[PDB]
Design an enzyme around this catalytic site. Sequence first.
Site, short mmCIF file in Angstrom:
data_model
loop_
_atom_site.label_atom_id
_atom_site.label_comp_id
_atom_site.label_asym_id
_atom_site.label_seq_id
_atom_site.Cartn_x
_atom_site.Cartn_y
_atom_site.Cartn_z
N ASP A 63 -2.05 -18.91 0.92
CA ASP A 63 -3.11 -19.65 0.24
C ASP A 63 -3.37 -20.91 1.03
O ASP A 63 -4.53 -21.24 1.23
CB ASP A 63 -2.64 -19.88 -1.20
CG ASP A 63 -1.35 -20.65 -1.40
OD1 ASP A 63 -0.32 -20.38 -0.76
OD2 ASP A 63 -1.35 -21.54 -2.23
N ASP A 97 -9.69 -10.06 7.87
CA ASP A 97 -11.10 -10.09 7.46
C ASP A 97 -11.62 -11.52 7.33
O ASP A 97 -12.74 -11.78 7.76
CB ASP A 97 -11.29 -9.36 6.14
CG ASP A 97 -11.21 -7.85 6.25
OD1 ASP A 97 -10.87 -7.31 7.28
OD2 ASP A 97 -11.50 -7.19 5.27
N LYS A 125 4.57 -15.79 1.35
CA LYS A 125 4.69 -16.52 0.10
C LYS A 125 6.19 -16.85 -0.16
O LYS A 125 6.73 -16.62 -1.24
CB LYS A 125 4.09 -15.71 -1.05
CG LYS A 125 4.00 -16.57 -2.34
CD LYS A 125 2.58 -16.91 -2.74
CE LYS A 125 1.97 -18.07 -2.00
NZ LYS A 125 2.11 -19.26 -2.80
N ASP A 144 -4.45 -7.92 6.09
CA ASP A 144 -5.72 -7.36 5.83
C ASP A 144 -6.67 -8.43 5.32
O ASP A 144 -7.80 -8.56 5.82
CB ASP A 144 -5.54 -6.27 4.83
CG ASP A 144 -6.52 -5.12 5.03
OD1 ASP A 144 -7.33 -5.15 5.95
OD2 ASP A 144 -6.46 -4.17 4.24
N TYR A 179 0.82 -1.21 0.00
CA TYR A 179 0.00 0.00 0.00
C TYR A 179 0.86 1.26 0.00
O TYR A 179 0.43 2.34 -0.42
CB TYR A 179 -0.86 0.01 1.24
CG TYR A 179 -1.80 -1.17 1.40
CD1 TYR A 179 -2.17 -1.93 0.30
CD2 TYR A 179 -2.33 -1.44 2.65
CE1 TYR A 179 -3.08 -2.94 0.47
CE2 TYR A 179 -3.24 -2.47 2.83
CZ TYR A 179 -3.61 -3.20 1.71
OH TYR A 179 -4.54 -4.21 1.83
#
Lengths: 345, 345
Positions: free
Chosen positions: B217, B245, B185, B241, B139
């Site tokens: 994942d 959630d 990852k 994030d 971000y």
Amino acid sequence: MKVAVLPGDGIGPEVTEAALKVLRALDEAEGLGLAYEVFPFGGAAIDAFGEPFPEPTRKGVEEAEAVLLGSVGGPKWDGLPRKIRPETGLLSLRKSQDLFANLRPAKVFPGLERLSPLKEEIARGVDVLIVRELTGGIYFGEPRGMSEAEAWNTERYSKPEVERVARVAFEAARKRRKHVVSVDKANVLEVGEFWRKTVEEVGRGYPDVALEHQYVDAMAMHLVRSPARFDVVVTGNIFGDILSDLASVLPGSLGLLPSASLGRGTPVFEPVHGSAPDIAGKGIANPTAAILSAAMMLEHAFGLVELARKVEDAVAKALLETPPPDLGGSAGTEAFTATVLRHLA
Amino acid sequence: MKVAVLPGDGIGPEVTEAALKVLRALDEAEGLGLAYEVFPFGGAAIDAFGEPFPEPTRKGVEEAEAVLLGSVGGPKWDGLPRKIRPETGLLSLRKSQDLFANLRPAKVFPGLERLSPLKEEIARGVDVLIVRELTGGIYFGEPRGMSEAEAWNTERYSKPEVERVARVAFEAARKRRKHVVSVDKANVLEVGEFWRKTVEEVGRGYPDVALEHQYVDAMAMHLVRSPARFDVVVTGNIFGDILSDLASVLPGSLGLLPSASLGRGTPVFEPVHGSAPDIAGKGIANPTAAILSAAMMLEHAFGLVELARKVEDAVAKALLETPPPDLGGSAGTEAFTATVLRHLA
């Protein structure tokens, strides 16, 4: 209907033949003009040829209209040079045919809400197709690096990469329920914003298909709370990877899941499950995923959507009628393929 | 125990006072030396002061040991210049105190598995804390851009950014069940690999805490299939994030969730729910999230873990005994705060 059949390893021969039994059965009944030839791939090809994707198979995949791929991989080959391992031939296969979209559908078939991690009421009717961009994004972005002090990686997409995966989403939605959700981080990321406006521009050529957009973190939340709300889902590569794996657990029965890889060259249809060497030759392997990969072939490689649907229905009824050991029943490979053919006839 | 109390907007005054009732009650019973002062923040401050974070509050937050924050936001302020909107004062507050870790716990309290999207058997015992890196990652990464042809964004992390969020994970785990999962990852990304080896190096100073690593994942898949397996989860900003959630929907009752932001300066404890202007003044607002934010304050700002636990237990019993309208009961704000105090006494 020209098919290159690559059974691979382990249960690969068994489940691939069950899917060919469904296909030969539809070919006699409707006259599809089925033609297929079986080719060495994976560990069998390393052992016979010395590499997992030898030139006979390359050529045969080159000359076919679709590949029905089995499962590849085995401990015997796990130590080999990366150049020749089974896992790497899968990437060589994708590369040769320039496949840029992975399609992974997760569907809770009627009466199997019991298998879901979610409560019945949420699991009922989930049928979602995740379209994952395969060639670009951060796994492949430049610049990239690591030092003692920091590490960096680039999520980069060009207008063509987004445009091509968007059209397979739109096209796929036309063959199912006419709705696409594109997922991004458009509210914080330039990539997100760019992705969104390119999919909305592409959306224009598909007036008959609805498009909405969701941010990825809200989309993970909906895939647990109301996943039945979605038809096709399209996104970039790492989010497609996270969201295809999220949606994959919703039926609660990972061995059932089919996969397709679509692109410029010959498309590939395969089960998501591995080669499961441990039960090869016992005739217990659940063929549901390979038969559902055959159905995705009819739908996506030949446009025979209605036939694909009919096959899915036969599978659905069969899983209820003679559940495999994985769903707590006893129907072995043959027995289960038989009740599919019995519903198909 | 010096607290700056920032009630904010809407139900902010009501739920913040319910948490102060629990705290004053513990202060009389144990002698915590509670001291607090109430300060204008958000829309109330825009209307009274002309900006959502005015200098009195800045100073008061500066001089306190913790902030108990209510909820900020309202339509009246939604059109204002970005410089002065309510949403932006929250970021100014985070910046002033250099808070670099967001902690979001999702817990299925006993007897409320009914509210989960997951089947009872999976929802039973989930209690997971997600630690999200707040200041860095994609971000905020440079380089970043968009042209007609492409768009780019950089997931970049330095050894200090990872190290600091890793220590709040480790420290938090010590106060709960002594296990941390770091998510990355590392198998495809340099960022991943670097993140992993920096957390493993930091892990060494915390011998009493277990560490494992999961790829993101696979971690999304486990958060639906066996979320009860995890104590603390730490990851970068965009994965934090996505995973905060994901885990947030597992109790199936979003209004219950507390939040904390931790850093160099004064820590902030707040509910995840918004200001819900529509029911402000009616005395129906569910205080569970604000009381649980008070409990996270005791745990993370004062180290009073055992007191925090006792408060959580009182909340748990209260949600069963006099369920709020959100859980299908009738207990209004006061009534519900009362049965918490009744279990606390």
